[PDB]
Amino acid sequence: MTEYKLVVVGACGVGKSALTIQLIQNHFVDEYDPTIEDSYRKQVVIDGETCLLDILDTAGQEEYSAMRDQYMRTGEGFLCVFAINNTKSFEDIHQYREQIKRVKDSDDVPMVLVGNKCDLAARTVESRQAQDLARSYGIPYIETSAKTRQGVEDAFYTLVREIRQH
Amino acid sequence: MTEYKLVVVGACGVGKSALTIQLIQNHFVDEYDPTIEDSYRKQVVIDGETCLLDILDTAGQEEYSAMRDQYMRTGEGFLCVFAINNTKSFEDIHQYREQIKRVKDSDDVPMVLVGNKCDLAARTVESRQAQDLARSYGIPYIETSAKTRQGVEDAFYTLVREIRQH
Numbered sequence: 445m446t447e448y449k450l451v452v453v454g455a456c457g458v459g460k461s462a463l464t465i466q467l468i469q470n471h472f473v474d475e476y477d478p479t480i481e482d483s484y485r486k487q488v489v490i491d492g493e494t495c496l497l498d499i500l501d502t503a504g505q506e507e508y509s510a511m512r513d514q515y516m517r518t519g520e521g522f523l524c525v526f527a528i529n530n531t532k533s534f535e536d537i538h539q540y541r542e543q544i545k546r547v548k549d550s551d552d553v554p555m556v557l558v559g560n561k562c563d564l565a566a567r568t569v570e571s572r573q574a575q576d577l578a579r580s581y582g583i584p585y586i587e588t589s590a591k592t593r594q595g596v597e598d599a600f601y602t603l604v605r606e607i608r609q610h
Numbered sequence: 611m612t613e614y615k616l617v618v619v620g621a622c623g624v625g626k627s628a629l630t631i632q633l634i635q636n637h638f639v640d641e642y643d644p645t646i647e648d649s650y651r652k653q654v655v656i657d658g659e660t661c662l663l664d665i666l667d668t669a670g671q672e673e674y675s676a677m678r679d680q681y682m683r684t685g686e687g688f689l690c691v692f693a694i695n696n697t698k699s700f701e702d703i704h705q706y707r708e709q710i711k712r713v714k715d716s717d718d719v720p721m722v723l724v725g726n727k728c729d730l731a732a733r734t735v736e737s738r739q740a741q742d743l744a745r746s747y748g749i750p751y752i753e754t755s756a757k758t759r760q761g762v763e764d765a766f767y768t769l770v771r772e773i774r775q776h
């Protein structure tokens with residue numbers, strides 16, 4: 445059985461935990477409890493193949509930035525998440541990309557750019573802006589809502605499909 | 611409004627028309643009526659962006675192979691479909707890939723490999739085999755069922771997302 449080591453990264457409060465919990469546990473976490481580092485595992489079938497998802501839900505809090513090297517070495521694919529109502533979180537993506545590239549010593553690490561909170565109307569990052577950033581990285585862009593479940597499976601399953609082209 | 615010119619290709623009877631009709635019209639065509647060439651259009655929102663899908667549903671019948679050059683020139687992205695219960699249809703994929711590459715004079719034309727009829731149990735093409743073929747092409751592989759609707763939106767929307775990385 446193939447195991448896929450996925451790691452969810454991004455700035456504080458963009459919805460990393462809510463996305464992961466929605467995928468794994470099928471409910472929306474309304475409250476905000478800052479994460480240190482949590483793991484989830486689930487057996488799923490993706491394109492006819494039974495596999496095991498091992499998901500690491502990481503800290504957006506800058507205080508825990510020292511933990512990044514460790515999880516970037518071990519992860520196989522990265523969900524790089526920002527919130528569409530948080531311009532700064534979008535600007536923060538590049539620092540994650542750059543660290544992952546440096547650590548895995550590769551320009552094509554499996555990755556998906558995720559614009560989360562697409563149910564909210566106070567958008568300050570346009571889809572086209574995120575599309576451009578993802579294009580430069582050579583990776584897909586997918587919008588999600590952990591709240592409505594829109595795009596949540598798609599984002600994670602796309603990341604699996606990216607690990608497979610690797 | 612961005613328009614995406616998608617073209618669905620593959621051997622006869624793999625489910626090109628059923629896939630397209632499921633996407634556009636939300637029902638499953640049980641009967642088999644061989645296609646000459648049909649067009650469909652639909653406005654959809656994909657990752658926060660309203661766009662227009664222009665879909666060309668092409669012939670799998672070898673008798674209509676002369677029509678291929680024309681539609682390959684005009685199409686922007688290609689859904690390359692085989693059926694997971696039809697080994698020959700999988701083997702036929704390469705002739706579509708090669709023609710598209712030759713016609714658009716490019717090694718990276720936006721494309722998604724689709725293994726359809728994944729609801730059927732008489733599988734003769736393993737996911738891993740199709741994954742390998744897609745990896746060599748540098749494109750995603752997605753399994754679908756036009757019958758159950760599984761993966762149908764995903765396949766077409768992934769092809770849009772591929773046109774965007776282009």
Ligand SMILES: Nc1nc2c(ncn2[C@@H]2O[C@H](COP(=O)(O)OP(=O)(O)NP(=O)(O)O)[C@@H](O)[C@H]2O)c(=O)[nH]1
Nearest residue numbers: 457458459460461462474478479504561589590591
């Ligand atoms: N409306 C809406 N709220 C969301 C969405 N995703 C997360 N939230 C909310 O945003 C807040 C922060 O979410 P959370 O998942 O904890 O963010 P995080 O990225 O894990 N934070 P940290 O990095 O501190 O661990 C929570 O109140 C959560 O309910 C979403 O898609 N839509």
Ligand SMILES: Nc1nc2c(ncn2[C@@H]2O[C@H](COP(=O)(O)OP(=O)(O)NP(=O)(O)O)[C@@H](O)[C@H]2O)c(=O)[nH]1
Nearest residue numbers: 623624625626627628640644645670727755756757
């Ligand atoms: N069980 C099952 N049957 C399917 C599926 N997709 C198509 N079929 C069936 O397969 C037959 C052929 O489907 P069709 O869409 O017409 O194939 P096509 O690729 O368009 N053929 P052509 O190239 O001649 O135009 C039909 O009987 C249809 O109901 C699927 O996902 N599951």
Ligand SMILES: [Ca+2]
Nearest residue numbers: 471472473474
């Ligand atoms: Ca809740």
Ligand SMILES: [Ca+2]
Nearest residue numbers: 637638639640
């Ligand atoms: Ca029917």
Ligand SMILES: [Ca+2]
Nearest residue numbers: 597598763764
């Ligand atoms: Ca989906």
Ligand SMILES: [Mg+2]
Nearest residue numbers: 460461478479
């Ligand atoms: Mg968290």
Ligand SMILES: [Mg+2]
Nearest residue numbers: 626627644645
């Ligand atoms: Mg047809």
